[PDB]
Design a protein around this ligand. Structure first.
Ligand code: SCA
Ligand code: CA
Ligand code: CA
Ligand code: CA
Ligand code: CA
Lengths: 464, 471, 459, 470
């Protein structure tokens, strides 16, 4: 039928200065790095790029900071990208954070003819009220701040209005495509590529394998080719693996956390301490691990023989998969999260509050990380268990009356597990349920930043 | 891993009187017929069902009317179902129409934690303003009317608000499932089963084929098993074919439809993705010239639809919008109904051609007769004409009555507003240009002055050529 | 203190081509005609005018049609104005209808920093959905249609969103002003002058009387002077009386509708004559939407007055306990449901109770006026009409052929017979004339009904 | 005509436990104290009251606290009510603040059939975002917080949604009414009585003077009688005057005076102005001759004069600080809906007020501190979030040396991006493209001391010496 195959230079020649790009990829998996390299060679400037993150130094989108071809990034996660973090802090780049599920669904909405939609993600955070620094001056001052989101009540709960993202170009990467643009992706490298593929006016797909029309089973197409304008088939190149991970008080906190697992739960684990609770699950408890970049049935690190760059986790570490696992795109992944289909989420934390409040995304000025999917995980109805050390690395209490750092979520934590104690957030205040070791409740009183109404208290169990 | 397999009777035993159900299927394609039979057997009443359609007589949802187990249908289409029609007209059942694309996306929004969203579909129509007859009384008077829709302007255009649908139960059918619930569908029998699978508190999947966890390639899963609660594997059965249409003009009226088709066929250009309504628009696909390559989209979730299949190829999982068995060409892709109408509502078709009861110089389009007269349902048409993209109406110039079909403003209920770009009739081609009509072409067998007589508004008639036809 | 008095010609000399004006007045009452005369003199073109109506031929705004100085009228009623109707039908003027209470509240909003607000008025009518012809071509064909309104649910009910109106100029008239611009109005000549005076960048008031600052009691100002930029004092003229009505139906069957202590509204049309038939010891208060309660019958000859008129521009008297208020307050009163009964004239009415009484497309050009506000508040509704139009055809029918004023709103039936009612969305027939039959009635142009408890009439 | 006259006791007898009441009055002016007295005699409990303020100790609404007859207050201001302060703090009473203008317009919208409307007032403040403490528990903990407001963009600016207020009863005071309920108010005692009178299901009006139908000029009824259900004529009583102010030094006063005399140069002839109590009001006393301005008081007056002489004090003529006030030639009265329509629609040429904190942003904090004070928004939020020129006149630092002028407010904000100029005893600053430009300094100081006394950087390239009005 149709033939949209085209060379790499003619595919991207239409990109003017000032142009808007949506770019697929999660870390490096599914990041169309050949195409970015071509956008670099041709020297376009003042790009506005929407994408999950900004790749990494010397790869994908990260390439385009070098000659400063980027005016503004709209992004969920900065990741391992020193140059992006540098160009932000000293005023070369405008950085707009968007929660990852909101970004994905805004792209899908822009492809789907939906000008706006509602979500509980980000409500009462600085991403809804405005006044996060989007741009700085050359000498450290605030130049631009994020504009607020509108809000509406539905069934007595407040939601954010999100706007369709529609770009001049959308740049995707797939394992396989035919000449009329049907695409098949592999592993967690699908991610944003589906909704990015839907939201651009001209969409350019780099395929690792070009086939004839008729060779893709119509029932296993991931992105129908109606969405694709130009197909490019670059020189084959290894996909960058950030953390090539294989298997031949953090642990202590993790073990108490293992007891939160119930048999038959679908769970989402955040990067640090919550991933470690995974190791300590008792043998009689079976759960399905979901990774936000688009997988249920996440396995542990693979054997050396089996490492695949297309199979990575939320922390950009190579991963295996268990029996009955399933892959899906970033729009469906946060449908599933925002929809409440996880039975449990566990997250890291910079700060947590008797309010039910949590701060885990940015330290103003000092650490720029982004919300990732944390604002979507905390804002759905799912039980949230924060796993953190009791105090700051420099001894400050992490549990307090009101949060001092920008909040990831408002009224959203159900339980707090620390190495010392465990608290349940009850009716807006902290109640102490467990404590461990030599440490007494007395010790818990000054380590903590707030008082707790504790008629009862039990001793803290752990996992073998 | 997990095992969610159950017998057919354990699966449905906790569905209690008054339950809301979302049910999968488009016509009989992907209609969980076996779960519906069991729901008849256990005799539950006052049910509220959300589905694309209402089933046909004696199949799927249609089975539940026999003992009057249904209180309310929320639907895009009725069509073939006679028992339903009688029941509606006698006051036995409430019938609430919803645009098909809005129905699929509302189920999706329900599963996705999205309380509401916006769409240009149904704007300015009776489904926006309220007053479609939803319930009759027991003596043919109006008991209930449709609730209206809120609307809001974005970027100068008007949009309807649509609310998430969440049901107590969802009933889906799949070609294949595993024990932890991952489903793989076959053909256009996917359709509503994906969003329906997402929006229920308890989701029940009937599978033609059960396999073990690990037997399905993670990359080929269509509904992740997190969505599915209960999987049932009933005795194998033939999915009912509504219209067994196969491949192997003789009348005056059929020649006027052939003439319009032969003109509509010159609207195709190379590289177009098209949606053709059944009838003339679909018939024009048979006169596409040899160099021109187009791809047909079916709203039930296919691109690359081919002609009726040969007798050796008929397949119940492959059907079109009119429930006719179809083939498929090289480069074909299947997708679910949420994606299908994302594709449509997002303007990804380069050409959308359909018929009309009445079309206006506005560019407004009507496809439904006076309400309370005869019942149709919006189907996907409202979604199709709101696409923001090239709409071409192919229809006869006048009713058999002599009454014009092209008029100043619609007297019939509007399908969509300010959406038609071109009108093709057996006598003329009109363009809609800044809300006014321009005569571009006339057939060999008329003159301009007769076109004037035959049309219920004036038009710009300064540059008119003779209408050409595909061979 | 401040002195804003100007000559007439200086006050308006800076109005530029294509300027938007808001103009006070209801018919001719409170219509700043001397200012409209000066604007004609100075020849300005392509004007966009927000006003309740457009005056009348040869008066107020009517004057500006003569040299085709107006491009667009945003209005609730045309009134007895031939040249406005003519220029509309001939493709000379754009005419955008706006319900009267919305028009008044939108002007208050634009002066009050409220960008938008919600009202039930016009929901489900052709003014919400677009499709009211706003501009014709020179040959009788459509060219522009009204752009639709957004809607939203609050408490289960649907409301329209109305946008604030802010104009370059506001033109008002008052009985009395001081030098710092404090205005005092007289009779029902207040009407839109208050909200009009609040919504302009530059607001100009013609006063019939100029007094010094200090001569107006602070407690008696109707439009505080802050709102007024320029006060002009023309040579005194007679305000035009369209219908000089004097003494020397309330419904024979709707008399019963009236209790003691009711506040009742009478719309333009047959309702107005009813003020002259109030029973002697019944005790109700009549409301006129141009801004009165305590309306009475037509005045005696020595007491007629162009500042006391009713909705139909007839001269009126007022009873003890009367209160005058502006059009913003008048429609808040109505929209908020403080009337116990309303009664309206009709073009046609339907059996389901939805009613149409505001226009027939391309032929009778009238406007919604306050009708759309009156039908969509909480208040009991009753229609009064001839049984047939002048062509001898039914005025009562099954469903409305003509555009609706509002849906499922009419409860009463006075014509040359009566009684029907709507309960739970359907009509229940309540009374039968004399000992005559259901069958005459059953030959209802519209529908089936409950005949289980029918009864004889109290007329 | 109609006759709605009744005795006091039979008019209030229909009020049941748990009833919502809208209550007119601003301070004590136009407060229906005799009806409040009667609601206390009849003993009804669990009341929810919407009113401008919470009354004062032992008068109007203050009387109801004595026997814990009140569950909830929705007000714009708390002020000199000690019973209520304690009760709020000890968990006996819920307190929801509403900006005064939004409160008035909500009541009007209630009476006017408008379920909701938009306003720039309170956008980006704790009154939009939620988290005002509304109810304590019995031991100093938080029990309830305020629910957020919805927001919407119109022409690229964000607005708050406000919902109609509809109460079971509305209670109003008027100088004069007739038997059919037409009411005439006097002085600034009109205020909320107009919109309160429109929003209640049953409205009850105490009148100081009853007259017959036909005794009031129909052209000068303030509240038409269709809004009134019951009229009541108590025994005549003197209205409590909170502050009897009349017209017939230290270093701290010298600072405020210098600030006042610079602020006086902000006035130009023909301006209508709203002046905060304190330094901004003081500044009107140094207006150069031949500069004429009209002062507006948010309780419903333009043309406010200085304090009255002893023979002309009048409880019905007070300002926003509830001080007795005179009026000048060409003054006008209006109700509180119209007051805030006038403010919110930008019809002041200049608004001047104090501040606890002001930001290089133009952001201003001057209404609250969590858990440490309750005053309420009052009219300040409305006054600063229309597009009118706002000038902040305030001392440069706190008495401890903490700067009041900072990069970003730590204190809860009153308005977002709204201050144009800041006048202190040391410096004048303009807010320009979201940062501070130092325009002037006192003869008393240096550019280097103001750098040290202010908590942000600023452009100090074109500084001039600060002039003063004589
Ligand atoms: C009241 C009406 C319906 C007019 O009705 P009347 O009571 O005068 O009845 P009428 O004299 O029998 O009819 C008036 C004219 O309508 C024509 N007519 C009546 N029925 C007809 C029909 N079926 N077909 C064609 N023409 C018809 C008659 O010829 C007559 O014109 P001829 O006699 O000339 O042949 C109209 O003014 C109207 O309602 N306008 C909308 C405003 C409204 O309803 N107001 C309520 C609030 S008051 C208001 O809003 C207006 C405020 C303002 O004026 O600014
Ligand atoms: Ca494209
Ligand atoms: Ca479930
Ligand atoms: Ca002005
Ligand atoms: Ca009442």
């Amino acid at each position: 039928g149709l033939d949209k195959v085209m060379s790499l230079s003619s595919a991207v020649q239409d990109i003017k200065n000032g142009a808007t790009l949506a770019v697929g990829g999660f870390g490096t998996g599914g990041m169309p790095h050949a195409i970015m390299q071509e956008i670099k060679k041709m020297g376009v400037r003042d790009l506005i790029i929407y994408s999950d993150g900004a790749g990494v130094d010397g790869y994908g989108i990260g390439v385009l900071f070098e000659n400063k071809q980027i005016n503004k990034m709209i992004v969920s996660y900065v990741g391992n990208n020193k140059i992006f973090a540098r160009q932000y802090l000293e005023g070369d780049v405008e950085l707009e954070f968007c929660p990852q599920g909101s970004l994905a669904e805004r792209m899908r909405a822009g492809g789907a003819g939906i000008p706006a939609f509602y979500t509980p993600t980000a409500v009462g955070t600085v991403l809804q009220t405005g006044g996060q620094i989007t741009k700085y001056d050359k000498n450290g001052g605030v130049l631009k701040e994020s504009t607020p989101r509108e809000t509406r009540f539905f069934g007595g709960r407040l939601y954010c209005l999100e706007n369709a993202i529609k770009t001049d170009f959308s740049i995707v990467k797939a394992w396989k495509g035919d000449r009329c643009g049907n695409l098949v992706f592999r592993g967690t490298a699908r991610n944003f590529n589906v909704p990015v593929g839907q939201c651009g006016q001209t969409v350019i797909a780099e395929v690792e394998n070009l086939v004839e029309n008729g060779d893709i089973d119509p029932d296993e197409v991931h992105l129908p080719g109606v969405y694709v304008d130009r197909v490019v088939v670059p020189e084959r190149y290894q996909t960058l693996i950030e953390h090539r991970t294989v298997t031949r008080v953090r642990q202590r906190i993790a073990r108490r956390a293992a007891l939160e697992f119930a048999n038959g739960m679908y769970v989402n684990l955040g990067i640090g301490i919550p991933t470690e609770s995974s190791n300590y699950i008792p043998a009689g408890v079976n759960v399905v691990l979901q990774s936000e970049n688009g997988l249920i049935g996440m396995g542990p690190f693979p054997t050396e023989d089996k490492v695949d760059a297309d199979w990575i986790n939320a922390g950009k570490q190579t991963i295996s998969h268990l029996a009955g696992s399933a892959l899906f795109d970033s729009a469906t992944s946060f449908a599933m999260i925002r929809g409440g289909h996880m039975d449990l989420t566990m997250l890291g934390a910079l700060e947590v509050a008797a309010n039910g409040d949590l701060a885990n995304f940015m330290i103003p000025g000092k650490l720029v990380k982004g919300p990732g999917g944390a604002m979507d995980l905390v804002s759905c109805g799912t039980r949230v268990v924060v796993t953190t050390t009791h105090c700051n690395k420099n001894g400050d209490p992490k549990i307090v009356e009101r949060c001092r750092l920008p909040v990831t979520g408002k009224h959203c934590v159900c339980r707090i597990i620390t190495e010392y104690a465990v608290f349940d957030v009850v009716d807006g205040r902290l109640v102490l349920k467990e404590i461990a070791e030599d440490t007494t409740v007395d010790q818990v009183k000054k380590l903590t930043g707030v008082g707790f109404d504790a008629d009862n208290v039990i001793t803290m169990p752990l996992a073998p």
